[PDB]
Amino acid sequence: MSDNLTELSQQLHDASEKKQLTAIAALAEMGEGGQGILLDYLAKNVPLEKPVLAVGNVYQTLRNLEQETITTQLQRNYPTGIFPLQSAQGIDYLPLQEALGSQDFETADEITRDKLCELAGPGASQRQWLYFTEVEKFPALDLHTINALWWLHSNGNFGFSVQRRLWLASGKEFTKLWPKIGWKSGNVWTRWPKGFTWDLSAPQGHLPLLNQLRGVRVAESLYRHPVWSQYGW
Numbered sequence: 001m002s003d004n005l006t007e008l009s010q011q012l013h014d015a016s017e018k019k020q021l022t023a024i025a026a027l028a029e030m031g032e033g034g035q036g037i038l039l040d041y042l043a044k045n046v047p048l049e050k051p052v053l054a055v056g057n058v059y060q061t062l063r064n065l066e067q068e069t070i071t072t073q074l075q076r077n078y079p080t081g082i083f084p085l086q087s088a089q090g091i092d093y094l095p096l097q098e099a100l101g102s103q104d105f106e107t108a109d110e111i112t113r114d115k116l117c118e119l120a121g122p123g124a125s126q127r128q129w130l131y132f133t134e135v136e137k138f139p140a141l142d143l144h145t146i147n148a149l150w151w152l153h154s155n156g157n158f159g160f161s162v163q164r165r166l167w168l169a170s171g172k173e174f175t176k177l178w179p180k181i182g183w184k185s186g187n188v189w190t191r192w193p194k195g196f197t198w199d200l201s202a203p204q205g206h207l208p209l210l211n212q213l214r215g216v217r218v219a220e221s222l223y224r225h226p227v228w229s230q231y232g233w
Helices: 002-014 019-028 030-046 053-064 068-077 095-099 103-122 141-151 160-169 174-181 219-222
Strands: none
Touching: 002 030, 019 030, 019 068, 030 053, 030 068, 030 174, 053 068, 053 095, 053 141, 068 174, 095 103, 095 141, 103 141, 141 160, 160 219
């Protein structure tokens, strides 16, 4: 047992950020010894000064074991998660992190729409859509925090940064991007969203949702926002 653990541990620490995930999955299933190695790795790499996907996968893989002991220990040691919940405008992202850590993407998606409205300010509360002019004025730090959380808790498959990359690969053509991320034309709402896939079986880039009731302008403004380049997304 010790041989594999040592090998797995060495992979987790030193292999390329491509083979780390493989070792994390195996360690999780190596009982207390493997989970212990995962826990020590977190302790040595948290809090994060930059989003590091392996750290998010280590934390989330441990949460996904759904063991009271492990979850409780993680709550005690990382009460606000593994990424500083920074805001430039007094926004509280703890409930968003908590929903993501519990893998409740539907609630995380609702909280995220509520936070973008909170950021937009006055007369956006409870609104089911943003205006592109509100998006252009969002602070970069908050969008970085929101995106980092989505990304770190979805093995890098969810997040506006992911949508933006697919958008760039689509030649910036929304008609090609939408089928790629699973947002069917005409599946738009005025009161509540329906027909989406609020779990990881969804396509890469599927969440967070951007209502297309008003067309592509808000998404374009968001993907063109300076935060992505600014923070290396």
